[PDB]
Amino acid sequence: KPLVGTGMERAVAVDSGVTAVAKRGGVVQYVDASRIVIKVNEDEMYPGEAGIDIYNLTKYTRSNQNTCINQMPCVSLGEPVERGDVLADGPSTDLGELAL
Amino acid sequence: EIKELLKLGDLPTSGQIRLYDGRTGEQFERPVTVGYMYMLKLNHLVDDKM
Amino acid sequence: TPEEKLLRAIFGEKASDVKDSSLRVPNGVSGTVIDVQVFTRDGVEKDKRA
Amino acid sequence: REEAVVWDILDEVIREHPVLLNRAPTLHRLGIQAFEPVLIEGKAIQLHPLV
Amino acid sequence: QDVVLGLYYMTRDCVNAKGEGMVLTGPKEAERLYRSGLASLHARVKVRIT
Amino acid sequence: FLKPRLVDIEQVSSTHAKVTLEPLERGFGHTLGNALRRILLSSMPGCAVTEVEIDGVLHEYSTKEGVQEDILEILLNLKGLAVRVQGKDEVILTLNKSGIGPVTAADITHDGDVEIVKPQHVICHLTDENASISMRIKVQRGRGYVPASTRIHSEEDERPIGRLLVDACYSPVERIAYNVEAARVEQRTDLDKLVIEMETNGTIDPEEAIRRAATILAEQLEAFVDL
Amino acid sequence: TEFLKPRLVDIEQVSSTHAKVTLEPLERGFGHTLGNALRRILLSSMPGCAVTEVEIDGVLHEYSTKEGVQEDILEILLNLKGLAVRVQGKDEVILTLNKSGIGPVTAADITHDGDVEIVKPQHVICHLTDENASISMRIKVQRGRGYVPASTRLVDACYSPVERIAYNVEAARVEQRTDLDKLVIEMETNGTIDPEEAIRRAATILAEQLEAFV
């Protein structure tokens, strides 16, 4: 994480696709190093199909510069998450901020 | 504000302290500035260029 | 050539009709194999591993 | 095979055998200078500060 | 740069420092005074030199 | 030429302690403290986990289904597990556990020389009711820093594709500091003390360590004594 | 957990006073750990016999000029501070230097005593000019352990044998290892202890303090 910072790093992490942002708010049903399944709140949920949002995380894979791009879950089993929250950090991102 | 945060820190206002050489163990004349700098590793890495 | 022919004669090795193009790890780089993919032309039999 | 014995033979051939060092924007003749090789672990070139 | 800052800090003089005014036979025991921590690097001193 | 000896060794936490050396002559407090700081921080006996063969894992870069820690991170967590042995130079510990919850360092199989100084140290979590992880954790003992890279030279058919190597972390010591305060013995001109405040992961006791330090110290002076 | 030991130790003599010794197989950081611990004790605590208190002929205080010698009182003490001697069965011996006549007054003109050994009889104390000129001084020389300057005391105690000590750590390549270090110890002495003896006795006192943790 940057110890000295600005406050844009939070915004940069989310707007760039490196991270995984919550589609809808709720409580996490399942947390794995592979995937993340979120149980949607009813106010945010559409009437049909009920639903849960399943985020399939990217694992160790080749980048353009031959670096490693790998996602890790930043949330824990059974935790409330609100829409627009960081579910998993990407490479060089820590808890929603940008750590280079 | 930085100096003020340093008062809450227990650390000097100067941002400099005394440092001792790990070899001779003797002191270093004058205080030296020590702190935490964010540092990046760029990829020019020596076992590419070589 | 004559002396290569004598060499094989003493050590009795059959020099193959096929030359080795095998892909080998570049000098100095060392790592762990995390994946393998095999693409094959349509109509050539996919081997065992594939 | 990089057998351990070859390293000592290299110290012999390096000893008295200068090498030429050069930088990217060569201007005057000092852009190339001869040095005596010193075997050094690692992939980086070490260059005398005064130069 | 670094080297010239060393020699500048080396031969320089402050107004009052450890060992000010004493006299030494030669540079050998001058360094011996400094390295042992008795005399400061910069102090006005008469020493016999050749 | 009055010689020193140790004095009250005050334990504070299971981690660190302040050892003290009472009889130091003029300036010798510094001559020792730095020379002792040197050997304390660097060359010391330690036992750090080395070879780890896990359940279904081919390499450190995959993910085992049912655990939210990447295999690479679990290896890294092991590098920070502090243990201590007595009579064995390598012991292989068998770790088994399942069920939703944290898998700590106390869930392993105890051995005669095994003492886990931090049973709460987190190896990884477990995200599913039935998911089971078995691992052979091969811990050996040695000195210094041996990175995983310099270990794959011996190799000699380490064919066990599942045996993932980690970097040897071997060392008890974390932070060593020495302070010399003037110690006044009832009669003497001026004498000094030695306050050595050290810091450790708990795998070595202070008196044992500071002894073996001076041991190696004088042992190198051996040749020096003659020529 | 076996511990690498040194080997090879070529001792290059530089005349009779000083020399550069070398030690090839020193592990990580031990070049400083040794070199510094030895530099410390060499410069500070060592056996020596150095002139301390000097009572002179006519002039008692340092602020004057003695008739018949071209050396100011301050400068003669410095030469005396550099006169190297050794005693045997005495913890203090008071010598007596006498001479007259035009010429140099050297260190062989003193009064020899049973325990007196002058290691530099040629050492110049001061000269002697026109006429006959008279110099007599009772020079009280004592024994101790270190460098005691005249301020804390009357001249500065030189009892150190050693003059200049330097340690250099150069990277030593043992047949198989990354980087190991060497130790080049260039020492300097007044001749009242032999270099090989000193470096022997130096480490001696060092390890002798360890006698409680062995």
Determine, for residues E25 and G81 on separate chains, whether the beta-carbon distance falls below 8 Å.
Answer: yes
Q: What is the resolution of this structure in A?
A: 3.9
Rounded CA gap, E14 and F64, in Å?
Answer: 68
How many angstroms away from the CA of G203 is the closest CA of chain D? 32
In three-state secondary structure terms, F71 is helix
Cβ(F68)–Cβ(A31) under 8 Å? yes
Decide: A and G in contact? Rule: 3+ Cβ pairs under 8 Å: no
From the number of C-beta atoms within 10 Å of its C-beta (0-12, 13-18, 19+), residue B35 rates as exposed
Q: Using a CB-CB distance cutoff of 8 angstroms, which residues of chain G are in contact with residue B21?
A: none
| CATH level 3 topology of G48-159 | RNA Polymerase Alpha Subunit; Chain A, domain 2 (2.170.120)
Question: Rounded to 5, what percent of chain D is helix, strand, coil?
Answer: 25, 15, 60
Residue D38 touches chain G, beta carbons under 8 Å = no
Q: Which secondary-structure segment (H or E) carries F91?
A: strand F90-98
Contacts of C29 (CB under 8 A, 6+ apart): none
Residues of G whose CB is below 8 A from F216: 3
| Shortest alpha-carbon distance between residue E30 and chain G (Å) | 9
G37 touching B (Cβ < 8 Å): no
Domain boundaries, chain F: 1-45+171-227, 46-170
Total residues belonging to chain F:
227
Chain G residue nearest residue F216, CA to CA: G3
Four-way CATH pick for F1-45+171-227: 2.40.240.10, 2.160.10.10, 3.30.1360.10, 3.40.50.800:
3.30.1360.10
Task: Report the residue count for chain G.
Answer: 214
Of G36, G32, G39, nearest to G170 (Cα)?
A: G32
Chain C neighbours (≥3 Cβ pairs under 8 A) are F
Q: Which residues contact G65 (CB under 8 A, 6 or more apart)?
A: G59, G72, G73
- Rounded to whole angstroms, how far apart are CA atoms G13 and F98? 72
State the method: X-ray
Q: Which are the contacts of F20, defined by CB distance < 8 A and separation ≥ 6?
A: F6, F7, F8, F9, F10, F193, F194, F195, F196
Cα separation, G104 vs A60, whole angstroms: 88
Instruction: Please state, in angstroms and rounded to a whole number, the distance separating the CA atoms of residues C34 and B31.
Output: 50
What's F46-170's CATH class?
mainly beta
Q: How far is CA F218 from CA F35, F39, G101, in A?
A: 11, 12, 57
A22: Cβ contacts below 8 Å, ≥ 6 apart: A38, A53, A81, A82, A83, A84, A85, A86, A87
The letter for the amino acid at A18 is: V
Dihedral sign, Cα of residue G18, residue G19, residue G20, residue G23: negative
Tokens coding F109: 């199989």
Residue E3 Rama label (left phi>0; alpha psi -120 to 50; beta): alpha
Taking residue G129's Cβ as centre, other Cβ atoms within 10 Å add up to: 12
E-strand stretches of chain G: 11-14, 18-26, 47-55, 85-86, 92-99, 103-105, 117-118, 126-128, 135-145, 166-168, 171-172, 180-187
DSSP class of residue G162 equals B
Cα gap G184→G19, rounded to integer Å: 10
Instruction: Tell me which residue has tokens 């107004």.
Output: E15
| CB F193, CB F22: distance < 8 Å | yes
Which among A4, A63, A92, A97 is the top mutation candidate for probing chain B, defined by the most B β-carbons within 10 Å of its own β-carbon?
A4
Is B39 part of the contact surface with chain A (CB cutoff 8 Å)? no
Rounded to 10 degrees, what is the CA torsion of F201, F205, F211, F216? Answer: -40
Who contacts D29 (Cβ-Cβ below 8 Å, separation ≥6)?
none
* Distance, CA of F201 to CA of F213 (rounded, Å): 17
Cα–Cα distance for residue pair F37/F174, rounded to 1 Å: 11
Chain C hits for F155, CB-CB cut-off 8 Å, are none
Q: What is the 3-state secondary structure (H, E, C) of F97-127?
A: EECCEEEECCCECCCCCCEECCCCCEEEEEC
Q: Which residue of chain F comes nearest to C29, CA vs CA?
A: F149
Q: Verify whether the Cβ–Cβ distance A70 to F70 is below 8 Å.
A: yes
Number of helices (H) and strands (E) in chain F: give both, helices first. Answer: 4, 12
Q: Which residues of B touch G32 (CB under 8 A)?
A: 23-24
- Do E48 and G75 count as a contact with CB atoms less than 8 A apart? yes
Sheet holding F17-24, edge to edge: F10-11, F17-24, F192-200, F173-179
CA distance D16 to D36: 7
> What span, in angstroms and rounded, lies between the C-alpha atoms of G85 and G35?
28
Contact G39 E24 (CB under 8 A): no
Residues in chain B with CB shorter than 8 Å from the CB of A1 are none
Query: Which subunits have 3 or more CB–CB pairs within 8 Å of chain D?
Result: B, G
How far, rounded to the nearest angstrom, does the alpha carbon of residue G33 sit from its chain's CA centroid? 24
Pairing of strands E23-24, E46-47: parallel
Closest CA to E30 of G155, G86, G147: G147
Residue of D nearest to G177 (CA): D41
Q: Which residue has the tokens 């001559």?
A: F31
Smallest CA–CA separation between D40 and chain B, in Å? 14
Comparing CA positions, the residue from G138, G154, G144 lying closest to residue G95 is G138
C-alpha–C-alpha distance, residues F27 and B25, integer Å? 12
Contact D4 G176 (CB under 8 A): yes
Tell the residue number behind the tokens 């260190």, with chain if given.
G107
The identity of residue G138, as a single letter, is R
Q: In the numeric block, which tokens belong to residue F224?
A: 């020096």
Q: Is G53:G154 a contact under the CB 8 Å cutoff?
A: yes
F63 contact A CB<8A: yes
CA dist G101 and A16 (Å) reads: 99
Q: Angle at which helices G30-43 and F28-41 pack, to 10 degrees?
A: 170
Burial category of F7 from C-beta neighbours within 10 Å (exposed 0-12, middle 13-18, buried 19 and up):
middle
Q: Are G32 and B24 a contacting pair at CB < 8 A?
A: yes
- Interface residue of G170, G173, G174, G180 to substitute, partner D, most D CBs within 10 Å: G173
Distance separating alpha carbons of residues G124 and G113, to the nearest angstrom: 20
Residue F106, CB half-sphere, CA atoms under 13 Å: how many?
Answer: 6
Q: Which of B20, B21, B23 should we substitute to test contact with G (largest number of G Cβ atoms within 10 Å)?
A: B23
Partners of residue A26 on adjacent β-strands: A40, A81
**Over the range A23-47, which residues count as b (16 or more CB within 10 Å of their CB) and which as e?**
bbbbebebbbbbebebbbeeeebee
Q: Measure the CA–CA gap between D39 and D15, rounded to whole angstroms.
A: 9
* The two structure tokens encoding residue A97: 């901020």
| Number of DSSP helices (H) and strands (E) in chain B, helices first | 2, 2
- Closest partner residue to E32 (CB to CB) among G43, G74, G82 is G43
The CA distance from F158 to G66, in Å, is 88
Report yes or no: G106 and G177 within 8 Å, Cβ to Cβ. no
Whether G48-159 and G1-47+160-214 are alike in CATH topology: the answer is no
Looking at domain G1-47+160-214, does it have CATH number 3.30.1360.10?
A: yes
- Cβ atoms A38, A50 nearer than 8 A: no
User: Which candidate, G74, G72, G116, places its Cα nearest to that of G94?
Assistant: G116
Q: Where do the H-state alpha helices sit in F129-191?
A: 148-151
Phi/psi at F98 (nearest 5 deg)? Answer: -160, 180
Q: Which two tokens stand for residue G149?
A: 């300057």
